Design a protein around this motif. Structure first.
Motif, short mmCIF file in Angstrom:
data_model
loop_
_atom_site.label_atom_id
_atom_site.label_comp_id
_atom_site.label_asym_id
_atom_site.label_seq_id
_atom_site.Cartn_x
_atom_site.Cartn_y
_atom_site.Cartn_z
N UNK A 89 10.97 46.32 12.18
CA UNK A 89 10.98 46.26 13.64
C UNK A 89 10.25 45.05 14.21
N UNK A 90 9.01 44.84 13.76
CA UNK A 90 8.20 43.72 14.24
C UNK A 90 8.85 42.37 14.06
N UNK A 98 17.99 51.19 28.82
CA UNK A 98 19.01 51.54 27.82
C UNK A 98 18.91 50.62 26.59
N UNK A 99 18.63 49.34 26.83
CA UNK A 99 18.47 48.34 25.76
C UNK A 99 17.24 48.70 24.92
N UNK A 100 16.16 49.04 25.63
CA UNK A 100 14.89 49.42 25.00
C UNK A 100 14.93 50.76 24.29
N UNK A 101 15.80 51.66 24.76
CA UNK A 101 15.98 52.99 24.16
C UNK A 101 16.62 52.87 22.78
N UNK A 102 17.62 51.99 22.68
CA UNK A 102 18.33 51.75 21.43
C UNK A 102 17.41 51.01 20.46
N UNK A 103 16.62 50.07 20.98
CA UNK A 103 15.67 49.31 20.16
C UNK A 103 14.61 50.23 19.57
N UNK A 104 14.24 51.27 20.33
CA UNK A 104 13.27 52.26 19.90
C UNK A 104 13.90 53.21 18.87
N UNK A 105 15.16 53.57 19.10
CA UNK A 105 15.92 54.45 18.20
C UNK A 105 16.14 53.72 16.88
N UNK A 106 16.37 52.41 16.98
CA UNK A 106 16.57 51.54 15.83
C UNK A 106 15.26 51.46 15.04
N UNK A 118 22.45 46.95 18.65
CA UNK A 118 22.52 48.01 17.65
C UNK A 118 23.12 47.45 16.37
N UNK A 119 24.02 46.47 16.52
CA UNK A 119 24.69 45.79 15.41
C UNK A 119 23.66 45.18 14.44
N UNK A 120 22.49 44.88 14.98
CA UNK A 120 21.40 44.33 14.21
C UNK A 120 20.60 45.34 13.41
N UNK A 121 21.06 46.61 13.35
CA UNK A 121 20.35 47.65 12.58
C UNK A 121 20.13 47.25 11.11
N UNK A 122 21.16 46.73 10.39
CA UNK A 122 20.89 46.35 8.99
C UNK A 122 19.86 45.21 8.86
N UNK A 123 19.73 44.40 9.92
CA UNK A 123 18.75 43.30 9.95
C UNK A 123 17.37 43.93 10.11
N UNK A 124 17.27 44.91 11.02
CA UNK A 124 16.02 45.62 11.26
C UNK A 124 15.59 46.45 10.06
N UNK A 125 16.54 47.04 9.34
CA UNK A 125 16.23 47.84 8.15
C UNK A 125 15.69 46.91 7.05
N UNK A 126 16.21 45.68 7.03
CA UNK A 126 15.81 44.69 6.04
C UNK A 126 14.44 44.08 6.34
N UNK A 127 14.29 43.51 7.53
CA UNK A 127 13.07 42.82 7.93
C UNK A 127 11.99 43.61 8.68
#
Lengths: 568, 568
Positions: free
Chosen positions: B305-306, B131-139, B294-303
């Motif tokens: 996935x990697x 479930x954690x990995x599913x959201x990370x992939x969706x992100x 998921x809260x980290x989505x704006x961080x992921x959009x900025x920096x």
């Protein structure tokens, strides 16, 4: 403090009023704040003062210090302390130009910068007012040239970016005020603040600007501050680097893009700035009390002269109030005495500045300097070790973000944290119902901190919902209980106008003055920053690739060695 | 705390190790820090631990806690306290999914969000990892669509502005991390953070964006938080208002501009957001421990996935270190024990987070929530009143600005302030000599706080310059004296990479865990924010023009009445 090796100060602890306040603490300190409200139905009014700002919009600065462990006996006694310590006389001495900054033998006249009445204030037998007004006029003329687009860059472009280069006293004020007065700003002028000597600060600003349309304002009292000079040298290098890359002649570029705010005339001339582009301020203007001077140029460029005059007038109105209003109705004196009551008798070493105004988000950081750098002293003017606690740790974030950050600790922590809740009745942004929703938290949080929620109230509320489980009630009961009796001061203004901001800062400057004078310390010097500067200067030539050191303690040695091993 | 009305906790104060630490405080607490360095020439090494981050760049997290009033006896005794309070067992219980958040009967698994080893962690007998990995992939999928320009707005424009709408746990992380990892960000994506319900926050963001090219990220755990919903409703109103003014059909616009980060699925659906655009996170993810979810989505959009995976891996490396490293070489445990030593024995109620990295300027505010909202408790898990001080007041500003702001108080104030100096060996911005000048202050300030400057040293230095005046020497001597013995921890990393930031936050999360467990409190609940919410909800319908109230105390009454008199 036996390591200071000076004799302990007895002038404050031997005061009849101090001994009395200690007695009143032992007697009434355990009495919850709500008790004072239950016994006095008029407490809200009697323990609150409204100070008009003298403006057409009928703006005011309202201090409500009722949510405190202060009864009439304690209040009378705090005012007696103010009378015994000679606050009224000290205030007059500060205002009239006396060398109250004893350790540096300098006057303390930030009040002169905002002296709109133009009442003569003398330093060395010379009225400082024409000089204050001359710089304000020079600031007016220059700021108008930047604002109207008259001031051109080297390539003929109007200024679009205003970069203030300065740290601490030459940063926090400019940042706080431009952030606080953003709806009164000229939007086409992007304000940037380079303060940190971390290359990142200058680098990120260089990425955000069109250097051709950028005015660099070098702000520094002594114009020797390592941070400000290193950043200013890099800002100059950046200007010259751009022009060289474009093949453009750099002659006379610095004079169009760089201006200075200093007391030191020669270091400004050595840097390569024209004298007519040097905005003068004086030694009697403390860095943390300089936003009213030449240091306020980026504020004036942002909000305009008229709004900067309003900023000064707000401060002037509070200066007049502070120096002339009776003790029991004097806002900064009362704010200071409430603080002394909590710091010295309750032992509350922290003070929260919680401004319920997003524009005031940099106010706690500003007040950190204003309070902590002023009153974080352990030696009196007489050279004696203080026998009382002095300046508290100031912290805070603009609400409501603080609520979802650290209010949990203020409500349910093991520390008593005096809070200053500052808010505006009218928002500058009429967005839906945002302001009423916002302000519901403002009044609620202070009420919450005061009244709390007893175990009986919690049990009732749970019995009120669908809770049949005595186990769940008993388990959740202490976690949901709020002891209350947590103090707060509410500062309410009609709106955050430039005049209102001026009024708020002046109040805090004067609060700091009284607290410093009660403690007998010099609230205007900063000898505590010198060791760090001297030790940094000694470590600087040691920070080279592969260099190994042994002259420091093993920690500093190991840290410098590790740095040098992996730096370049 | 007799107002909590629960019996006092004796489980901690009755510990053999606690009684011993009190004895060691009475014995060695007055011994200056420099004495420990003079007696042990290897103190720098023995009281420091280097933790590799497992990366190719050989990055590390180095904790130097040597600048402390801790000798070998005290260290052994602090570690004994950790053993008696069952920290090792509690850590295993937190990591393996146990309901350690006793008051809410929830697991505490923020460690699962960054569990790169994908070792099965069970909640209700089900491995949470897929479930954690599913959201990370969706992100990953979604963030790539925003970054490459594939995700279009209603008018077909690529996203240029990413507006995160959330408060506290759904704000501080996103703000701190995007600010901290700006050199690893995609510059063409401007990040905005709307958190405050002050209309100003949404209004200023609306002025700074091209709404057509804006992705609004509504972040809220319960999706009921008044602040986040009011701002999100205004952000939606703004989108619809723009399209209506341009005469454009608004159908399906919300689904392209709005996404949600929540645990609550129904409130997201009620708002008008598509289910595929809802990024899931769980109840076991505390708000102040959610930047990894998921809260980290704006961080992921900025920096990207990697870089977000690197952020997670840094946290994972410290999670593994925390759970497996021996007590004497365990960084978060030692950091926590140094803190307990100062808070509970020295009575130091404040803790300064001084990051010497401008990118980390929002780190102190983040840690304020992480520490204060977690550990600002006065009741144990067992429902008993704490008999010790708990969470301290966290404050600080990125250096070197703090130096010119409040270091005067840390050096020469009447308060002992434990400081955490965090710095990078290598800057991401190679600007002249800025980093060596910057870092000279970093090592100097800790050295300064520790060694100080005795009266003898001051007299000598003055005699070294051209001072012939015994009056000037005698007068300036106590003001220029630094007692020293002011503690500090130095956190040194090779560079502030996403992995390094992850490592730093995890260390603090784990420090907070240990401190909370030593005190016996629930570091994962937040019952202290409820009274303010309930009282705000009661004051909200009373904030109408001209409305007069009398149901509160006279202060709150007078304040609400004054507001209502001059509001609209």
């Amino acid at each position: 403090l036996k390591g200071v090796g000076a004799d302990a100060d007895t002038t404050l602890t031997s005061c009849a009023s101090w001994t009395q306040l200690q007695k009143l603490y032992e007697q009434y300190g355990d009495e919850p704040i709500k008790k004072h409200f239950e016994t006095d139905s008029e407490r809200g009014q009697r323990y609150s003062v409204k100070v008009s700002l003298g403006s057409k919009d009928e703006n005011f600065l309202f201090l409500d210090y009722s949510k405190s462990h202060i009864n009439d006996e304690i209040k009378c006694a705090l005012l007696r302390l103010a009378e015994e310590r000679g606050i009224r006389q000290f205030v007059q001495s500060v205002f009239r130009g006396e060398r109250v900054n004893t350790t540096e033998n300098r006057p303390v006249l930030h009040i002169a910068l905002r002296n709109r009445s133009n009442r003569p204030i003398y330093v060395d037998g010379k009225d400082v007012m024409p000089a204050v007004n001359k710089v304000l006029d020079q600031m007016r003329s220059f700021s108008e040239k930047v604002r109207t687009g008259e001031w051109k860059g080297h390539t003929g472009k109007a200024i679009r970016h205003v970069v203030n280069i300065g740290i601490g006293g030459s940063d926090l004020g400019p940042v706080m005020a431009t952030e606080a007065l953003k709806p009164f700003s000229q939007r086409d002028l992007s304000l940037h603040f380079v303060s940190n000597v971390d290359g990142t600060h200058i680098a990120e600003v260089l990425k955000s600007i069109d250097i051709e349309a950028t005015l660099f304002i070098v702000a520094s009292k002594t114009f020797t501050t390592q941070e400000t000079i290193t950043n200013a040298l890099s800002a100059r290098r950046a200007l010259l680097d751009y022009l060289r890359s474009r093949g453009i002649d750099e002659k006379g570029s610095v004079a169009k893009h760089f201006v200075a705010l200093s007391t030191n005339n020669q270091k400004v001339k050595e840097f390569g700035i024209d004298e007519e582009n040097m905005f003068q301020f004086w030694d009697w203007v403390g860095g943390r009390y300089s936003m009213w001077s030449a240091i306020g140029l980026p504020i004036m460029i942002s909000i305009g002269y008229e709004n900067f005059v309003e900023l000064l007038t707000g401060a002037h109105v509070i200066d007049e109030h502070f120096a002339n209003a009776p003790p029991e109705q004097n806002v900064p004196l009362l704010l200071a005495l409430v603080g002394v009551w909590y710091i010295n008798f309750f032992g509350a070493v922290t003070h929260a500045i919680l401004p319920y105004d997003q524009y005031l988000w940099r106010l706690p950081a500003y007040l950190q300097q204003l309070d902590m750098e002023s009153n974080g002293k352990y030696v009196t003017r007489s050279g004696k070790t203080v026998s009382t606690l002095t300046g508290p740790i100031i912290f805070g974030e603009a609400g409501t973000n603080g609520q979802h950050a650290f209010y949990q600790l203020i409500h349910q922590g093991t520390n008593l944290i005096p809070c200053d809740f500052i808010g505006a009745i009218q928002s500058q942004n009429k967005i839906g119902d945002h302001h009423k929703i916002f302000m519901s938290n403002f009044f609620a949080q202070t009420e919450a901190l005061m009244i709390g929620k007893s175990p009986s109230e919690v049990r009732r509320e749970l019995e009120a919902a669908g809770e049949r489980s005595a186990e769940k009630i008993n388990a959740l009961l202490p976690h949901k209980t709020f002891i209350g009796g947590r103090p707060s001061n509410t500062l309410l203004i009609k709106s955050l106008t430039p005049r209102a901001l001026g009024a708020i800062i002046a109040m805090y400057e004067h609060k700091v003055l009284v607290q410093g004078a009660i403690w007998g310390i010099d609230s205007y010097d900063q000898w505590g920053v010198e060791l760090g500067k001297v030790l940094a200067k000694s470590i600087l030539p040691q920070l080279r690739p592969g260099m190994r050191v042994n002259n420091h303690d093993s920690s500093t040695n190991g840290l410098i060695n590790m740095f040098n091993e992996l730096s370049h």
